[PDB]
Write a protein that binds this ligand. Structure first.
Ligand SMILES: *[C@@H]1O[C@H](CO)[C@@H](O)[C@H](O)[C@H]1NC(C)=O
Ligand SMILES: *[C@@H]1O[C@H](CO)[C@@H](O)[C@H](O)[C@H]1NC(C)=O
Ligand SMILES: *[C@@H]1O[C@H](CO)[C@@H](O)[C@H](O)[C@H]1NC(C)=O
Ligand SMILES: *[C@@H]1O[C@H](CO)[C@@H](O)[C@H](O)[C@H]1NC(C)=O
Ligand SMILES: *[C@@H]1O[C@H](CO)[C@@H](O)[C@H](O)[C@H]1NC(C)=O
Ligand SMILES: *[C@@H]1O[C@H](CO)[C@@H](O)[C@H](O)[C@H]1NC(C)=O
Lengths: 490, 48, 49
């Protein structure tokens, strides 16, 4: 509430049970000609108050007048970043019903750190009552003349002029009419005879269409994520996935994940992209080893067991698997390479078990001194450190928009439109542009058509086997002709 | 024309340039050089 | 004159298919598959080029 009672300015922020018709009622006593504030019916209750402020006491007239409007006030109210901004100004004028045309500035008056949500407001008036106002509170009252106007703000761009003393005397709206765009461009309130370039009008696309083939199968993840058994890391397991929808938003009902990270793809978008040739890797490692599954890493797992290509786009998922893979005597089913002559290549698997010659004296399969067996058994027990407990780790790798694909994720397709600037997805390819019938003749083994410009210009619709040509909308250019400001405005 | 790369027409159409050249030829053959200093004065071609 | 003009325009247009150090040379390939924070660096590299 902002109120200006007979004495003080009061600024309250509380929870009020406001009246349906709150107002002020000032009674005029005929016996002693004076107007005195008696009724203030604002709210029923005020429970919790956060911010308060009261200005100094003062005295106004409050007497009813009969002359013309002599006070014009303009106020502007903003709420930005928890700040309530009140700009104000007042002016003496003679107009009663007309709205005057003038250029006046509004000087900042008050700014408050309120930080509340305001979506409606209500103005607050006063009432006048006397012997000539017979009746109850609801009827025994007059109105008294007063008027006001309300308008709405909008994000725009103006040009303003600053005089010598520092006052805003004039402004021009950059986006009202073309001459104003020209004045805005040249930064001058005066424009001389000729032609000018302002901007470029772009036709805007309305509708959007998605064209996807038919997929009904669901992906074999219960034999990837709910796999009764996992293999040793050195002989890491691989699996091919195709012709199914990969609903990764259903990753949460059955389980929860220690680490769930993706490189080159943001997880939220996984549903909207059609992937190509999903490969799913699976293994189990030690928690300490979980920090080796990343591009450009070191360590025995990352060196002699597993490697990633540098440009590995895809996701790493891993969850602790202690309970399933902990045995009180020790889960020794898990074995890993420790010694190898050279580093491994990405997406390579070696299962050789040969006596490693640490130094000289070739072992010849003796495993003597300086001769060691490259493979070693993990020992997993329930009573071990968290950094030592087993972890089930899965890698998802795939291609994107480089070949015909079949894994698109969950989405919905729609109809087809023609000869209207629109937006389109075609098996994951994106774009906007009018779609006309094509006279090209694709051979039966290819799905696109390209230009020198290096952008697609045709497409085979993945449903009707038809060939559609994309024509971009006419951007053009905008120029304006003027005979000068002085002579005319046309 | 489909990347924000526009070409623009010249100011004079080719017929206008053709008219200009025809005018120059007429001037030289029927008036010598005297049209290039003031009013066009005629004079036969043999004496030019 | 005509040959020089055409050559310059063809080079200026063909120069739109290089990575300049990004993962791909299409801004639509970057509107998807990424979120703003880590997309903006590659958008930066394309701008510079
Ligand atoms: C105006 O409000 C202030 C603050 O609540 C109060 O102290 C003062 O008495 C009020 N005066 C009138 C006339 O209501
Ligand atoms: C808000 O009002 C309720 C009821 O009067 C009270 O229990 C609660 O403590 C108040 N909270 C604050 C922050 O004043
Ligand atoms: C403010 O309240 C309105 C009405 O309840 C609501 O629609 C709007 O979302 C709210 N905004 C904030 C920031 O609370
Ligand atoms: C600046 O203020 C002075 C004093 O009011 C006034 O005389 C003068 O005209 C003003 N000049 C401008 C440029 O507004
Ligand atoms: C795993 O199993 C649960 C129930 O045992 C099942 O509801 C869920 O769909 C399965 N999820 C995966 C990813 O295998
Ligand atoms: C998908 O199903 C529709 C009918 O529902 C069928 O006409 C069409 O041939 C199928 N295949 C594709 C690629 O749209």
């Amino acid at each position: 509430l902002i109120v200006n009672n007979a004495t003080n300015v009061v600024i309250k922020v509380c929870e009020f049970q406001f009246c349906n018709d709150p107002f002020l009622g000032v009674y005029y006593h005929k016996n002693n000609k004076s107007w005195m504030e008696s009724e203030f019916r604002v709210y029923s209750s005020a429970n919790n108050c956060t911010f308060e402020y009261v200005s100094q006491p003062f005295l106004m007239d409050l007497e009813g007048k009969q002359g013309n409007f002599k006070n014009l006030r303009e106020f502007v109210f903003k709420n930005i970043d928890g700040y309530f901004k009140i700009y104000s100004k007042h002016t003496p004028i003679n107009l009663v019903r007309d709205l005057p045309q003038g250029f006046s500035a509004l000087e900042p008056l008050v700014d408050l750190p309120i930080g509340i949500n305001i979506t409606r407001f209500q103005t607050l008036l006063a009432l006048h009552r006397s012997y000539l106002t017979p009746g109850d509170s609801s009827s025994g009252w007059t109105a008294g003349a007063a008027a006001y106007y309300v308008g709405y703000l909008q994000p725009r761009t103006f040009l303003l002029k600053y005089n010598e003393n520092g006052t805003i005397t004039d402004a021009v709206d950059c986006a009202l009419d073309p001459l104003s765009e020209t004045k805005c461009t040249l930064k001058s309130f005066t424009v001389e005879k000729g032609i000018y370039q302002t901007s470029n009008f772009r036709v805007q696309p309305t509708e959007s269409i998605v064209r996807f083939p038919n997929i009904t199968n669901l992906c074999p993840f219960g034999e990837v994520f709910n796999a009764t058994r996992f293999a040793s890391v050195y002989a890491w397991n691989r699996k091919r996935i195709s012709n199914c929808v990969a609903d990764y938003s259903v990753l949460y009902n059955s389980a929860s994940f220690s680490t769930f990270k993706c490189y080159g793809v943001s997880p939220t978008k996984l549903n909207d992209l059609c992937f190509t040739n999903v490969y799913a890797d699976s293994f189990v490692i030690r928690g300490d080893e979980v920090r080796q599954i990343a591009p450009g890493q070191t360590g025995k797992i990352a060196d002699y067991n597993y490697k990633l290509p540098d440009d590995f786009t895809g996701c790493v998922i891993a969850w602790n698997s202690n309970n399933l893979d902990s045995k009180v005597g020790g889960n020794y089913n898990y074995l890993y390479r420790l010694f190898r002559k050279s580093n491994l290549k990405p997406f390579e698997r070696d299962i050789s078990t040969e006596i490693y010659q640490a130094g000289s004296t070739p072992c010849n399969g003796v495993e003597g001194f300086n001769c060691y067996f490259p493979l070693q058994s993990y020992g997993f027990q329930p009573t071990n450190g968290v950094g030592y407990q087993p972890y089930r780790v899965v890698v998802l790798s795939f291609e994107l928009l480089h070949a015909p694909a079949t894994v698109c994720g969950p989405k919905k397709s729609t109809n087809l439109v023609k000869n209207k600037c629109v937006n389109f997805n075609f098996n994951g390819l994106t774009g906007t542009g009018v779609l006309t019938e094509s006279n090209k003749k694709f051979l039966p083994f290819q799905q696109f058509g390209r230009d020198i410009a290096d952008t697609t210009d045709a497409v085979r619709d993945p449903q009707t086997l038809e060939i559609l040509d994309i024509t971009p909308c006419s951007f053009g250019g905008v120029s304006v002709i003027t005979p000068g400001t002085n002579t005319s405005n046309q | 024309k489909f990347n924000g790369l526009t070409v623009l027409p010249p100011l004079l159409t080719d017929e206008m340039i053709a008219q200009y050249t025809s005018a120059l030829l007429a001037g030289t053959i029927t008036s010598g050089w005297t049209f290039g200093a003031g009013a066009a004065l005629q004079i036969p071609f043999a004496m030019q | 004159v005509v040959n020089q003009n055409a050559q310059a325009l063809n080079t200026l247009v063909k120069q739109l298919s290089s990575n300049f150090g990004a993962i791909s040379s299409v801004l639509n390939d970057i509107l998807s598959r990424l979120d703003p924070p880590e997309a903006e660096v590659q958008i930066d590299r394309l701008i510079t080029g």
